[PDB]
Amino acid sequence: YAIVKTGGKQYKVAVGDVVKVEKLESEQGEKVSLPVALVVDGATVTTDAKALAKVAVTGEVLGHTKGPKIRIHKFKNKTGYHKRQGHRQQLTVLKVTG
Amino acid sequence: ARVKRAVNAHKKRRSILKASRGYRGQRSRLYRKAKEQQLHSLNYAYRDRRARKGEFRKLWIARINAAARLNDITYNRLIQGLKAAGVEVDRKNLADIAISDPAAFTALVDVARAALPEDVNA
Amino acid sequence: STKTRGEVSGGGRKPYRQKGTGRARQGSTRAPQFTGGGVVHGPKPRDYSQRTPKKMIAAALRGALSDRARNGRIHAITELVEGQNPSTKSARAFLASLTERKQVLVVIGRSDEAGAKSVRNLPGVHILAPDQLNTYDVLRADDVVFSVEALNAYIAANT
Amino acid sequence: EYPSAVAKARFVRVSPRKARRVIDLVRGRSVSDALDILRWAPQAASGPVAKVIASAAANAQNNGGLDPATLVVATVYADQGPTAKRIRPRAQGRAFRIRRRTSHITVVVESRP
Amino acid sequence: AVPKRRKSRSNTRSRRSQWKAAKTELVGVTVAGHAHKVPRRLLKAARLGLIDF
Amino acid sequence: PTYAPKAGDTTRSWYVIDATDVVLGRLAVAAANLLRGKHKPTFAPNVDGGDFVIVINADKVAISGDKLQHKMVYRHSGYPGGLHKRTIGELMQRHPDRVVEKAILGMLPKNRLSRQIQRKLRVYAGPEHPHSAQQPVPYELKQVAQ
Amino acid sequence: KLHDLRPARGSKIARTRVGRGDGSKGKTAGRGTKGTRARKQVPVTF
RNA sequence: CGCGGCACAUCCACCUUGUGGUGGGUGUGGGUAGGGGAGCGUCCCUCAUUCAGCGAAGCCACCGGGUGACCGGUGGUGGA
RNA sequence: AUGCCGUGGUGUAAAGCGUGGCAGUGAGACGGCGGGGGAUAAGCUCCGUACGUCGAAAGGGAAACAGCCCAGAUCGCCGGC
RNA sequence: GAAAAGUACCCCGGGAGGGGAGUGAAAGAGUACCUGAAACCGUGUGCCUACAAUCCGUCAGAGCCUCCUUUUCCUCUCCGGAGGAGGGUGGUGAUGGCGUGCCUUUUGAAGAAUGAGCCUGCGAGUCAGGGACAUGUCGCAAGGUUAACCCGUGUGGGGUA
């Protein structure tokens, strides 16, 4: 297995491993190379750029699954203040093969 | 033109109650009582997502400490060493490794131990 | 129309005095917030009309007519009668054979033999004399029908 | 599975909670023993209920064709009926309200060998 | 003395539910003809025929 | 995420501390963290994890006499006054197990798990521990590094 | 025609409904004080 | 700081090279009374269009949708 | 010493001025530094400061805490310093 | 309900009331009658709860229960998802962290400062005037504009005081 750095974040992945990640420039079926921080083959533990810049994670994208819908407002107190809004982060699903 | 404003009231009224299900007593039955609780509930969620982030950091750190002390090293020196080595690895996945693969964790400890300079002098 | 305080019968009595009752500051039984009460800022019978310039009216009207003429929607006729008597049937056949539309505005003048009679009972058909030629009707109707006399007086009036 | 029979009485002049107090004694009990209980209920308000259960027996046995000896009170309701009200004078001109609450009693019976 | 506040639905139902009648009965009650059941207290009267349904 | 908080995935072994020369503070602290499970990478405050801790020779806990004759323990009743004031040394002569137990309870969190954990503790004043059917695991104290 | 007919941009600004909530203008929504102004428009002369 | 999504001013390049928009960059975006700008929904009228006793409106539940005021769809009751 | 008026260069999306339209405030509190009344007093009170904060500002820390310390939240993140 | 077609008859029952039949398109149209909301009462039922204190929630989050996809497998296999693993909607939510209710008015409030028992409906910044100042936009252009009144029919044309 390996730890991949993507979206400013680190995810634990494996060959054939579906994981929800941040939105990036992709379509429906494209191997996007992503850098890693640590590669673990079960005993060997890597550390340096000699390996980190040597291998990567090439996974395809099957769709763009949306995230959870957040309904929110801010309410302070006796002042009278209700700041209503929403948010739903657009994500995309990555099927790890490399 | 009398408009009979009920419909406009009923929209948000039922919209709130069906989301209010789960509260106790009148908090899940009455509009004007449910409305208030949702104000505080959502402020709580607003701050608690941020707290959730920090709390998960703390749990991950604590578990890292446990593994490190089992490997006869403290958190302070562990992280310092990882910085000197250049291991830009998060605490989340570091803890996951600390559980599912203690051996690789120990290997990272040996890396950090090697990376530490010598002592408390500079 | 509506009805408010002062028009509603009663309500001058002030029961439930202001201390020792445990009740509200009543003051009158026909006040808005009491049922059977008066209306606040209600629909008073406004008589209103947006008085406008003659120049604006005339320009709008001739503008719309010019649009119909540019679009080929003018049907200038000489008369409309089987000699004297009216015929809804005949006018229906003629107009349906000529215009092929629903909404029709007709201009004849003060001639009630069949001009202002055959056109009745025809859904979507309105008829008026030039001096009463508004724009709402014109903009609504597509295939506008004019009599020769209507054009003569109208054009002469507008030089 | 359980071809039940239903009987009920409306506009009964008996207070709901008092009826509840009575019918709590008969949930899941046999018809004949339940009626015996109601015959010897000191509450002196079980009468109407016993009448209703009797109507369950008559319908279950005659309309349905079942054996009364095997009937069990599947469920019983003490529904809140149309409440009326009548005014009562008290001291100092205080005009209080005394209510006349009624109920609707629904009984379901079924054979449970 | 007055109730300062409403009692919660929970506690009002607990007190309301702590209001019940007793259950007493007897089986095997032999009288003339059908063995009608009575309570033990009135059994002797039943044996003497001093009841009516 | 986490993989520890899973029903059945808790190992509760029996550790034994011959708490003689050890001081009260350090003793109670080691028992506290060890009992709660902070030595494990699977620590999960939401659950009653950790191993069981057995305290031996509680009568011998290294407490300075300067506090044996000054530090007091207070047990209020609920009645006017009713402050059952009693010397810690006297408590050591009578029920030292209560002394140690109390010290630990004040080092554990004010929660229900305090009680679920507390029931995992066995403190006996004497040297001999009746419960040897299980596996006693002598535990020693240290300063790890740094 | 009328289904095309529309007005010029900039005319017919929305009427400002006042006492219609906090998101629009406020609870007092204009007479935002507690002195005379909250009950009466003051003579400009005085 | 990082990784991503909206917004107002401004800078730059295009479509009418500010009608109003399109692409990129910097900085900005706690806020009561209160000012400004743009919006959500209900009823009625007109015009055009259009579903409907092969089941409208209102109501109940369910699944989804928008940045918001909110919406759409499905199923049931009911019957204009 | 500070502080203030005015001038000449430099730097900063920009603040400012005059001119019109529509409002609010017109009771302020505390803390820091200088002062009077009071007793060398007060969670006192009347002033000053291009001193702040609260008021109208959430969050961290001070055990809990409107006014002190740090820090001015557009939204999301199971990422770091 | 369009119409009284007003539940004949039979069975419980003192009666009321109910049930089975039956009319009616429909009885989810029975005089207490279109639709039948909410507060409220009540029955059944999945989950939690009798060693534990916090505006009565949120976020973490175990394990049960409902439903459901893939799958070893039940090969009885031209049937099915029985069961199980795993995965995933919607409940319950053990246990931990966090956290002093709205509004009004106040220098200052969760309040031991006030008002609200709950639900439903109603309820508060609008209108007349060729009023007045400023503004956006639309006619004309040293002009512009009519009022009253007249004629005419949908509110059009005249009418210069």
Side-chain angles (χ1 to χ4, degrees), chain G residues 6-23:
Chain G
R6 64 176 179 85
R9 185 180 295 278
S11 68
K12 303 295 183 183
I13 294 171
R15 183 176 294 155
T16 302
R17 290 179 291 163
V18 173
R20 297 293 180 271
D22 292 310

Side-chain angles (χ1 to χ4, degrees), chain D:
Chain D
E1 185 176 352
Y2 294 167
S4 68
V6 179
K8 61 181 180 180
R10 296 178 65 87
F11 303 164
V12 176
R13 65 181 183 176
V14 180
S15 177
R17 287 167 64 192
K18 301 286 179 59
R20 287 180 72 257
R21 186 178 182 195
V22 172
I23 63 173
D24 287 344
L25 300 174
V26 297
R27 293 182 185 274
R29 301 297 298 277
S30 70
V31 170
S32 65
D33 293 308
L35 291 175
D36 292 335
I37 291 165
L38 297 175
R39 183 171 67 252
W40 297 113
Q43 301 299 304
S46 66
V49 176
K51 289 180 178 182
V52 170
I53 291 169
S55 294
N59 286 319
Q61 185 177 12
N62 289 341
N63 290 338
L66 302 178
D67 187 349
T70 63
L71 296 178
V72 178
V73 175
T75 185
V76 60
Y77 298 173
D79 290 342
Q80 181 69 58
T83 298
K85 64 179 183 179
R86 299 295 187 278
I87 295 168
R88 179 176 292 172
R90 298 294 299 275
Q92 299 180 337
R94 301 292 180 185
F96 287 181
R97 296 180 182 180
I98 306 303
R99 296 179 292 172
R100 293 287 190 270
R101 297 175 71 192
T102 61
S103 65
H104 304 290
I105 300 170
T106 302
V107 177
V108 184
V109 299
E110 63 189 19
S111 175
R112 294 184 180 187

Side-chain angles (χ1 to χ4, degrees), chain B:
Chain B
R2 181 181 291 279
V3 300
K4 304 297 288 289
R5 67 187 179 84
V7 174
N8 288 331
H10 289 290
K11 288 181 180 179
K12 69 181 178 66
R13 190 184 67 80
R14 69 185 183 181
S15 295
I16 291 297
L17 292 178
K18 72 181 184 181
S20 75
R21 292 180 293 170
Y23 301 112
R24 291 178 170 84
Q26 302 301 312
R27 302 295 180 93
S28 60
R29 296 292 184 270
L30 310 184
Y31 174 77
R32 67 186 298 192
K33 299 296 287 182
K35 183 177 178 184
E36 293 169 5
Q37 184 62 28
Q38 289 179 357
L39 301 177
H40 294 291
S41 294
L42 292 174
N43 282 340
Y44 291 166
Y46 178 68
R47 74 189 186 193
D48 289 345
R49 288 196 298 272
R50 291 172 165 80
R52 182 187 62 193
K53 182 180 180 181
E55 289 295 315
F56 281 4
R57 289 175 65 88
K58 290 191 290 184
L59 292 173
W60 292 333
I61 290 166
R63 290 177 175 170
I64 290 167
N65 187 350
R69 291 176 187 270
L70 291 174
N71 291 313
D72 294 324
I73 187 167
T74 60
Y75 183 80
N76 293 332
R77 301 299 178 187
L78 177 61
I79 302 302
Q80 185 181 15
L82 289 169
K83 287 179 179 179
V87 178
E88 186 182 359
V89 176
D90 68 10
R91 295 180 178 90
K92 174 178 170 178
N93 291 305
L94 180 57
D96 184 74
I97 287 169
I99 295 171
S100 69
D101 187 353
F105 184 86
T106 302
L108 292 173
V109 171
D110 288 343
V111 170
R113 288 178 182 276
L116 292 169
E118 182 176 0
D119 62 9
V120 300
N121 292 310

Side-chain angles (χ1 to χ4, degrees), chain F residues 70 72-76 83-86 91 102:
Chain F
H70 291 94
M72 305 299 290
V73 171
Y74 298 163
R75 299 289 295 170
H76 192 273
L83 184 64
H84 191 79
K85 182 170 180 179
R86 185 176 293 275
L91 291 173
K102 179 177 171 63

Side-chain angles (χ1 to χ4, degrees), chain C residues 81-156:
Chain C
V81 61
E82 296 185 358
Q84 296 295 312
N85 291 323
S87 175
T88 299
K89 182 176 179 181
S90 298
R92 182 176 180 184
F94 175 71
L95 296 173
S97 65
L98 177 61
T99 63
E100 298 183 353
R101 294 290 184 272
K102 182 175 179 179
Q103 184 72 56
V104 179
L105 175 62
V106 177
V107 182
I108 298 299
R110 300 296 299 277
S111 178
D112 295 333
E113 294 80 13
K117 296 292 184 182
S118 295
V119 301
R120 297 179 185 271
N121 306 312
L122 297 175
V125 181
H126 292 87
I127 187 165
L128 55 79
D131 291 342
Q132 298 297 309
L133 180 62
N134 63 14
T135 64
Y136 176 71
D137 293 332
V138 174
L139 291 169
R140 188 176 66 256
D142 292 339
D143 289 330
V144 180
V145 177
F146 289 146
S147 70
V148 167
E149 293 178 353
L151 291 172
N152 288 337
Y154 178 88
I155 295 167

